[PDB]
Point group: D2
Chain length 114, copies 4
């Protein structure tokens, strides 16, 4: 199934933050309406917060997270969870190798802000 | 129901990261086996990271997130989500007022690391 | 925080199913736009299905689950989870006593159908 | 990533329930410790409960859900969510065709019981 794709409410600010847990350098791209809106990278085996940014979901509300290592797409897992019918988290994990820890880059999207 | 309390596997490293979205200064305390292990404080209405840390769950695995504003506890909402039977997120939102956006401090715990 | 309240897409069929795990007879009410749309009542300590129904979310999309035992409201916990940006679960647990298992009535709402 | 595989606490009763939403007849197999423990089949486009059973997770705690339609494996999506650190849901959706609704067979596992 497709993973790392989320429909947000239109014209809404959201946070996106990425964490690294890998010997390989992670690159995280965040697309809004199919155009890159943020890119983060780093290399940590201790959960470094390699990047954070505030974005707007725009007219479409379509947000996509992609992760690559050495130019090769990682395998993604994702879900969205909503608490008290108000607080939203879109969650992504990724695997760059064979150990299947799926933490090599972790991406958290949250809304609303403010 | 109790919120913000999570049982992690014992003796496991985990990440904890807090974001703020409120005019009030947020104080996030993270307890491991009922003792304060980390504390983050800050103010933002733009989802700023007010702190991040890596902790060990210890012998009990018991982790609790508390959120307060000027010493008064916020109302918490939380859940744990597990992707591909491996990647864990413990998620907390909090409300310091009446608008019920539950984003005033947002706390993300993730494991495993490395 | 309020629990057991969910905003569904409008005019959408959804499933609602209730399970019981308690010495007490559970009464589950499902409200659509603040009006009772289904009521399930039964008793089991073995996860028996006490009711299942397909309902329409109507013009508002507002769906609320209430649980009581001998007329006393149970304490609720809830969340919504979305898989592959398409498959939705609205999940409710409830506690009628002191053991905090939160399984006394378990309610699963799923959509889309068909 | 692997989907439909869950690690439950050992020697624990759990509920497993399957719903159908497809023109094709669904076959759901539930494995405990790699051995078939339950099997459900049926056709519905109205969320019929094609099976519900209480099983024991045994010494391993390993539970796997497989879904097929006239012998062809469906593509699976899955996640686990835990509410109030007590109430567990393991969720599976499946796609047998081209529309990517992922509801063709829906399987919900819940624990603890009683
Ligand atoms: Ca890895
Ligand atoms: Ca890793
Ligand atoms: Ca607020
Ligand atoms: Ca706020
Ligand atoms: Ca109980
Ligand atoms: Ca019970
Ligand atoms: Ca389908
Ligand atoms: Ca379908």
């Amino acid at each position: 199934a497709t993973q790392g794709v989320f429909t947000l409410p239109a014209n809404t600010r959201f946070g996106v933050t990425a964490f690294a847990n890998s010997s390989g350098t992670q690159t995280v791209n965040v697309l809004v309406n199919n155009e890159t809106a943020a890119t983060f990278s780093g290399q940590s085996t201790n959960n470094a917060v390699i990047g954070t940014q505030v974005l707007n979901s725009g007219s479409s509300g379509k947000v996509q997270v992609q992760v690559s290592v050495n130019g090769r797409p990682s395998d993604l897992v994702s879900a969205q969870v909503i608490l008290t019918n108000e607080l939203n988290f879109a969650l992504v994990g990724s695997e760059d190798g064979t150990d299947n820890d799926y933490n090599d880059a972790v991406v958290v999207i949250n809304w609303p802000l403010g």
